[PDB]
Amino acid sequence: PQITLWKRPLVTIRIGGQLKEALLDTGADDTVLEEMNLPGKWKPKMIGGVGGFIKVRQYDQIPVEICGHKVIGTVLVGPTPVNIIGRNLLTQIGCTLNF
Amino acid sequence: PQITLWKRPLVTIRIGGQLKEALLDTGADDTVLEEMNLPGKWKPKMIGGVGGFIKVRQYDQIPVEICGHKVIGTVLVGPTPVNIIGRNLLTQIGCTLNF
Numbered sequence: 374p375q376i377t378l379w380k381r382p383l384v385t386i387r388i389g390g391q392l393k394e395a396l397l398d399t400g401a402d403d404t405v406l407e408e409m410n411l412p413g414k415w416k417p418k419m420i421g422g423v424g425g426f427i428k429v430r431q432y433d434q435i436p437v438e439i440c441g442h443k444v445i446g447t448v449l450v451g452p453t454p455v456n457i458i459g460r461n462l463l464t465q466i467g468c469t470l471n472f
Numbered sequence: 473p474q475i476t477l478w479k480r481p482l483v484t485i486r487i488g489g490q491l492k493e494a495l496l497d498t499g500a501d502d503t504v505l506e507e508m509n510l511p512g513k514w515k516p517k518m519i520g521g522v523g524g525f526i527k528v529r530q531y532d533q534i535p536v537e538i539c540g541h542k543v544i545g546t547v548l549v550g551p552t553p554v555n556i557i558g559r560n561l562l563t564q565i566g567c568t569l570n571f
């Protein structure tokens with residue numbers, strides 16, 4: 374698809390049994406999801422945005438379905454205002470900015 | 473051009489004679505520049521990112537040059553860690569997210 378930017382670029386994603394809305398974010402290095410109890414090992418990290426830092430849990434090698442595209446990578450979980458799909462997963466779906 | 477997302481989509485912008493590096497950010501409603509002086513009236517605004525809110529100064533109808541494209545719109549100035557080009561100006565350059 375070709376997504377214009379008059380509205381927030383929100384899509385539905387699937388992570389295990391859970392459907393969520395998430396923002397396609399070219400200004401995010403990383404994918405950050407709202408609080409959820411994913412399986413397996415995690416590492417505590419801090420990530421920075423506008424307004425300062427938040428503490429997140431880093432889970433590696435997590436399958437996520439984004440608009441029917443299957444990706445597998447790193448997901449951070451923490452007190453983000455919105456679910457954010459960052460470049461680490463945008464690159465796995467083949468996303469580019471065009472103008 | 474087409475910009476891949478392997479690295480941060482940083483581009484050079486020109487504003488009022490000044491060169492700046494800025495991030496093309498589909499996850500930003502607004503364009504927000506690091507602290508700088510601009511002419512004309514402004515008013516305070518609070519904008520929220522992942523780590524909370526910052527207070528910025530809102531300037532309307534500011535011309536910006538982004539990758540050869542002349543745009544005019546609202547620019548927020550304040551304590552952002554990075555210059556951000558948000559959807560208000562991305563729409564003016566006709567940017568789409570493609571995958």
Ligand SMILES: COC(=O)N[C@H](C(=O)N[C@@H](Cc1ccccc1)[C@@H](O)CN(Cc1ccc(-c2ccccn2)cc1)NC(=O)[C@@H](NC(=O)OC)C(C)(C)C)C(C)(C)C
Pocket residue numbers: 398399400401402403404405420421422423454455457459497498499500501502503504519520521522553554556558
């Ligand atoms: C290298 O660090 C990052 O990549 N940081 C990312 C990040 O914060 N990205 C910012 C751009 C950025 C990059 C580097 C340093 C600082 C900031 C944005 O891509 C995503 N972010 C994601 C975001 C989106 C919505 C909201 C929000 C806020 C209030 C109410 C509803 N939503 C908060 C954060 N958007 C905003 O913060 C924007 N906020 C905004 O559009 O609010 C409507 C601003 C910018 C206009 C302030 C994450 C923490 C998401 C990984």
